[PDB]
Amino acid sequence: NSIEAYLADSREKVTLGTVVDCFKGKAVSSKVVPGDVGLINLSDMGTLGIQYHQLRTFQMDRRQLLRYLLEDGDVLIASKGTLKKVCVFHKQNRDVVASSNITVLRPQKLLRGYYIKFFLDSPIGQALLDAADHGKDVINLSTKELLDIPIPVIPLVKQDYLINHYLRGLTDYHRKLNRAEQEWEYIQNEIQKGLG
Template identity: 55%
Template sequence: MNSSQQRLGDQVTHFKGRAISSKLEPGLVHIINISDISASGIIDYTNLKTADLTEKQYSRYLLEERDVLIASKGTVKKVAVYEQQNYPTIASANITILRPNDTIRGYYIKLFLDSKEGRRQLDKADNGQSVINLSTDSLLDIKIPSVPLVKQDYMISRYLQGLGDFQRKISRAKQEWQRIQDDINRQLF
């Protein structure tokens, strides 16, 4: 491991997501909840809940491309990176958002936090007993290896390419499995 490390909090700005009342009418603002993030950190943008909020009510919570979303409450530690959507999107209150500065990439933070060492440090930041309760101060105190942006970009590129390949293979495997099941059902009846 690279011996040079920096405190995560020195490389990001951070904020909590917005508390959303269940009584709000559906609207233009899309909300990412912990349940919209898979255990592997993929955000499902297809079924996000929406809320009717004024710009004043949501503008300070508005997500930006490559923001890192970390489940700070719940039962599963989840780390995801937000990809820009063509509608206003915010995160719910049980998600901590890290906005990288110009020395670090959001996906690099995710790669580190998903590593064994990153998970160990996330575990230390967790004050919960049976459910997760990540301390924001402890999260920001996590030490992350200092890596030049060009190397971060290379790692991210390999990760995203591998993830894309993985998702395509899973999709093809599911299609093939469905074809086999359909074929067997046709033979049964």
């Protein structure tokens, strides 16, 4: 009922497919040799973002890499798993690619990666994502229906503004969390000494 009303919203809205280039990621085996190309899995896709600090690494390059290569802005959506998850890749020091359990959306025109993330995480965004899900107590996301999810269009300035509000708050959150931890590790070191 909420999707009907959104589709009748009368809001200038594009289709995700109209504006993005979409490709699923390299399916690799768990038992490969570690290497230089890092690999984002459903478990590397964190709450406050992609945990690039614990990425499984593998070693496959050349023109193979060039098609699976994650670029700054790409929208990693969870195509498979328990929890549907939308994450935005940030250019890492290394080359990085996604698993095949992740649909990659490269925003090309009109929409910003983070604004697609904001829309998709909304109650309606989730509803549209669940339309695309044809799993039984598991996720299986129709790459085609996904690309058929409409997204409201607003200017790139009101987009880049809300991203900055969001990114400002998140860097704040990380400043607060890392302090609290350094302070907790200091208390922990008080104990260690305490038994010394």
